[PDB]
């Protein structure tokens, strides 16, 4: 797994060589020793072999000596620290360390920047490791995807975490002082919050999306003030999203709505008076 | 501790034998415990 600490053991040179193996494994399968010696743009065996010893000791690389075929294998940690080094260069992350959100294809940590403003890190682990090209590649494409979806969600006004950065399969996002529908006990204006959560699914099917899974743990609720009680309805849902043209968009949309109403019925004992928005009205709305 | 190898750990304190599991597995055949099933 992820041990961010170890990254502050590496120098300019160890990152240089690790980068060289990153350019050399995306060109050839198993990068041999001379490939790393010649591509790294280094001086001698001194710097490169010392660097590789560091990376191999700190589990960023694996030595594959296949019947005279000497080569190397970049582990997930290597990719992690290269994205993280790219972000250290792009002045986006400065410290890491507090795990809230252990997803299947996503790990969520708590990070910080130069200024001290708290943020969140969603790295993507497809298959967690028997590394081929597809695991790393599709994790990279996964976070690309989710960051682009996220950027289009922040751009169009939706209350969705502002995407700051997409370092490969890793994504830096805004920390949101919120609480999920489980941890929430009661609200001062439950009908307004329902109106909000329905108007949102309306505008989402107006954009062309149907976030198939709109449950209780999905919806975060950020509090801005304690005297006046200001709420904000954050929603984490992107790879489970289903476009408005798919054959099955109907019961997905109406499952979202039925879940909104069923939770608002149980936890806050507030049933909706206006009829729930069907798929058809939103099929014309887009 | 295990009255064989200076070990606080592994102790089978049962029946007053006090051998850690590692040494007791070795001395098992000399004590009387044999492999049947």
């Amino acid at each position: 797994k992820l041990d961010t600490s170890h990254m502050r053991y590496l120098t300019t040179d160890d990152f240089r060589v690790l980068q060289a193996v990153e350019q050399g494994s995306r060109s050839h399968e198993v990068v041999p020793t001379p490939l790393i010696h010649q591509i790294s743009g280094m001086r001698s065996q001194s710097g490169t072999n010392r660097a590789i010893s560091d990376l191999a000791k700190l589990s960023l690389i694996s030595k594959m000596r296949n019947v005279k075929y000497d080569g190397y294998r970049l582990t997930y940690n290597g990719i992690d620290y290269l994205a993280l080094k790219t972000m250290l260069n792009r002045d986006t992350v400065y410290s890491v360390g507090n795990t809230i959100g252990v997803g299947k294809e996503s790990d969520i940590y708590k990070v910080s920047d130069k200024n001290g403003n708290p943020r969140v890190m969603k790295i993507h682990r497809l298959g967690r490791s028997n590394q081929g090209a597809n695991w790393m590649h599709l994790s990279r494409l996964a976070a690309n995807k989710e960051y682009q979806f996220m950027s289009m969600l922040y751009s169009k006004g939706f209350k969705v975490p502002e995407p700051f950065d997409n370092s490969r399969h890793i994504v830096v996002m805004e920390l949101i002082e919120g609480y999920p529908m489980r941890r929430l006990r009661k609200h001062k204006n439950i009908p307004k919050l329902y109106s909000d959560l329905m108007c949102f699914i309306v505008d989402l099917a107006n954009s062309g999306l149907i976030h198939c899974d709109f449950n209780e743990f999905n919806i975060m609720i950020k509090d801005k003030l304690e005297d006046e009680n200001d709420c904000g309805f954050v929603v984490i849902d992107f790879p489970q999203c289903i476009s408005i043209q798919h054959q099955d968009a109907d019961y997905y949309f109406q499952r979202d709505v039925d879940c909104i109403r069923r939770f608002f019925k149980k936890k806050l004992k507030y049933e909706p008076k206006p009829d729930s928005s069907m798929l058809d009205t939103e099929g014309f709305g887009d | 501790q295990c009255r064989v190898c200076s070990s606080h750990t592994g102790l089978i304190r049962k029946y007053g034998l006090n051998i850690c599991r590692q040494c007791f597995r070795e001395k098992a055949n000399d004590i009387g415990f044999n492999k049947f099933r």
Partner: protein, 120 residues
């Protein structure tokens, strides 16, 4: 020619050293290094308790970020303060014994000094 005038010798000069006028450069900065020494007290399979490098816990707080290097050629960092006596827990690159020395490197700016002509 570098020398120090000694009255006792025949030549009233002690010839110290020689060399050349190299550079008219200010860009050369000189950092006085300062090493702090500490003994690695106790050992756990990843965490080493280190002894006698501080004597207050707040002092240990003050130097948290600063890297720890061992003359055995190994890197590391501090974790947290153990006692009220400055003991501090630490993580490292390799496995270190009680024969190693954990050390800190701190640096200060050193400034060139004014010169006066010499006669007689």
């Amino acid at each position: 020619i570098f020398f120090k005038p000694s009255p006792t010798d025949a030549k009233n000069i002690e010839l110290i050293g020689h060399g050349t006028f190299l550079n008219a450069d200010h860009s050369r900065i000189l950092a006085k290094r300062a090493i702090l020494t500490g003994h690695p007290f106790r050992f756990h399979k990843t965490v080493v308790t280190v002894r006698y490098m501080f004597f207050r816990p707040e002092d240990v707080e003050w130097f948290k970020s600063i890297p720890l290097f061992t003359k055995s050629g190994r890197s590391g960092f501090i974790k947290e303060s153990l006692g009220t006596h400055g003991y501090f827990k630490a993580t490292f690159d390799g496995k270190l014994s009680a024969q190693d020395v954990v050390a800190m490197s701190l640096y200060k700016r050193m400034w060139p000094m004014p010169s006066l002509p010499w006669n007689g």
